[PDB]
Ligand binder design. Structure first.
Ligand SMILES: CO[C@@H]1[C@H](O)[C@@H](COP(=O)(O)OP(=O)(O)OP(=O)(O)OC[C@H]2O[C@@H]([n+]3cn(C)c4c(=O)[nH]c(N)nc43)[C@H](O)[C@@H]2O)O[C@H]1n1cnc2c(=O)[nH]c(N)nc21
Ligand SMILES: Nc1ncnc2c1ncn2[C@@H]1O[C@H](CSCC[C@H](N)C(=O)O)[C@@H](O)[C@H]1O
Length: 259
C-alpha cells in the first residue's frame, strides 16, 4: 500500500540479496558494452559510447519521443553519454552538458565521436544553483534512488521544479522521473503535462529495481494510467523464474568533427 507502486517498492525492499540481483535483470533489455568499455580503457576516443546511457537515449530518439535539435542542454551529464549521442544528430547545433563529478561521481570523458566539437561538458557543477539558459532541447537524467519512496518523491519533485525553470513554449525534452508513482509526483506531473504536454514513458533498458519513467515531449497519455501500467509490469516480473536480460549491440557514434 497505498499506491500500487508503493506495494511494489516494499516487495522490492524485502527481497534477499541473490533474489534482488536476479529480479533486477529479469526480462529486461541490456546493451552489449564489453568491447566499447575495453576500447575506452585503452584510450580509444572514436566510435565508443562513454556509458550505456547513449543507447538509453537512442531508444527514445529513434522512436521520435524526443527529437534533439538546436542548442541542447544536458543536466546531470555524467561521463557524457547523452551529450555525445546528441553531438552526432543532424539538427543539433550545440550541446552543453553539466554534472557534479568530483569524488564519488562520474567525470566527463573526452571523446572524438562524431560531432564531439559541438559538445562541451563541465564538471563540478550543481545544476540546482546555476541560472537557467535558453535552449531548444532540455535533457535531464538526475534522480538518486532511496529505499524510502517518500525520500524519492522529495528528490523527484526537486528535479521537476528544476526542469520547469529551463523549459520554454516549444522545447524538446527528455527528463528522468525517478519516482513517478508517489501521489505528490503524480500531482506535479499532471500540472506539468497540462503546461508543456508530453507524457511518461518506460524505457525497456531500465532495470526492474527502479520505477523510473521519462517525461518525453513527443508523447501523450494519461499520467496515472501510464504509471499504474508500469507498477503492474514490475509486480508481474517478481513472478518470473530463471529469467534474465536480452542483449542488443551498442551504439556506434562514429568519429570526426562537424561544421
Ligand atoms: C545501503 O542501502 C542501499 C542503497 O540505498 C541502495 C544501493 O545504492 P545505489 O547507489 O547502487 O542505488 P541505485 O544505483 O539507484 O540502484 P539499485 O538498483 O542498487 O537500488 C535501487 C533500489 O533497489 C533496492 N535495492 C538495492 N539493492 C542493492 C538492494 C538489495 O540488495 N536488496 C534489496 N532487497 N533491495 C535492494 C532499494 O529499494 C533501492 O532504492 O540499495 C540499498 N541496499 C543495499 N542492500 C540492501 C538490502 O539488502 N535491502 C534493501 N532493501 N536495500 C539495500
Ligand atoms: N545536482 C546535480 N548537479 C549536477 N549533476 C548532478 C546533480 N545531481 C546528480 N547529478 C549527476 O547526474 C549524473 C547522472 S549521469 C546519467 C547518465 C548519463 N545520461 C549518460 O548517458 O552517461 C550523475 O553523475 C550524478 O552525479
Amino acid at each position: 500500500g497505498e499506491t500500487l507502486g508503493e506495494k511494489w517498492k516494499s516487495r522490492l525492499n524485502a527481497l534477499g540479496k541473490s533474489e534482488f540481483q536476479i529480479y533486477k535483470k529479469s526480462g529486461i533489455q541490456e546493451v552489449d558494452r564489453t568491447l566499447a568499455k575495453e576500447g575506452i580503457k585503452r584510450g580509444e576516443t572514436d566510435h565508443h559510447a562513454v556509458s550505456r546511457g547513449s543507447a538509453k537515449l537512442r531508444w527514445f530518439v529513434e522512436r521520435n519521443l524526443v527529437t534533439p535539435e538546436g542548442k541542447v542542454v544536458d543536466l546531470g551529464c555524467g561521463r557524457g553519454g547523452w551529450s555525445y549521442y546528441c553531438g552526432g544528430l543532424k539538427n543539433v547545433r550545440e550541446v552543453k552538458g553539466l554534472t557534479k563529478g568530483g569524488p564519488g561521481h562520474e567525470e566527463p570523458i573526452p571523446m572524438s565521436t562524431y560531432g564531439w566539437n559541438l559538445v562541451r561538458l563541465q564538471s563540478g557543477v550543481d545544476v540546482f544553483f546555476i541560472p537557467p539558459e535558453r535552449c531548444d532541447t532540455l535533457l535531464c537524467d538526475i534522480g538518486e534512488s532511496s529505499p524510502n519512496p517518500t525520500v524519492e518523491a522529495g528528490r523527484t519533485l526537486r528535479v521537476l521544479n528544476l526542469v520547469e525553470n529551463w523549459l520554454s513554449n516549444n522545447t524538446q525534452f527528455c527528463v528522468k522521473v525517478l519516482n513517478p508513482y508517489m501521489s505528490s509526483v503524480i500531482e506535479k506531473m499532471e500540472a506539468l503535462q497540462r503546461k508543456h504536454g508530453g507524457a511518461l514513458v518506460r524505457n525497456p533498458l531500465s532495470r526492474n529495481s527502479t520505477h523510473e519513467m521519462y517525461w518525453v515531449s513527443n508523447a501523450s497519455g494519461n499520467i496515472v494510467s501510464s504509471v499504474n501500467m508500469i507498477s503492474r509490469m514490475l509486480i508481474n516480473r517478481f513472478t518470473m523464474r530463471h529469467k534474465k536480460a536480452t542483449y542488443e549491440p551498442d551504439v556506434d557514434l562514429g568519429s570526426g568533427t562537424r561544421n
